[PDB]
């Protein structure tokens with residue numbers, strides 16, 4: 001099986017491995033993309049894998065140690081790929097490691113998976129070549145479709161709670177105004193909330209975007225009194241099944257999520 005750290009990396013793997021081997025995802029829905037605790041049985045799955053796919057030690061810190069014992073012909077470390085380096089985005093002294101939100105990095109990931117699976121399973125070269133073909137065709141078609149869906153929303157300002165979507169935003173020309181540090185469970189105290197609400201109004205935000213783990217109460221406490229619309233973005237596509245068309249569905253779903261709140 002191909003074992004991916006995170007569900008959207010599973011989407012990409014499952015396109016290339018389709019009908020060749022299963023793909024499995026380690027990280028549960030709602031668990032920490034950084035600090036999940038791998039169980040002994042996750043380690044075994046990693047070591048048993050035909051191929052391990054992950055972003056790298058600056059994202060899934062939780063698997064760094066476990067993947068040391070695994071040869072390089074059996075792992076794709078996306079942040080270390082030659083074709084990814086120039087696409088890695090540094091800002092305010094930090095690199096964005098949410099690489100599965102970049103269509104171009106997703107394409108280099110698919111290419112790297114394809115290349116490793118072909119060396120490992122030459123008896124399936126043709127199916128794997130066909131799978132990479134279908135993945136790229138669907139990615140091109142989705143890119144253009146999403147591009148057109150989000151083109152008319154340039155200039156609609158918004159804030160997010162998790163500044164994780166920059167690859168997708170910079171690629172499709174979206175206009176985020178900035179981000180608020182907000183606990184998903186506990187709303188901010190009156191002072192900082194006051195500041196947030198006035199920024200929402202001052203900078204003329206159309207929307208504020210939370211993620212599925214935020215309690216609605218906390219999101220409402222933020223948007224209350226402003227007339228800024230509330231949105232939800234799922235950067236992990238927890239509602240999408242693995243499968244050949246899944247990465248494209250993921251990109252399109254995310255487009256819909258944005259468009260839905262920003263549309264006017």
Ligand code: NA
Pocket residue numbers: 081082083085086
């Ligand atoms: Na390079």
Ligand code: NA
Pocket residue numbers: none
């Ligand atoms: Na983060």
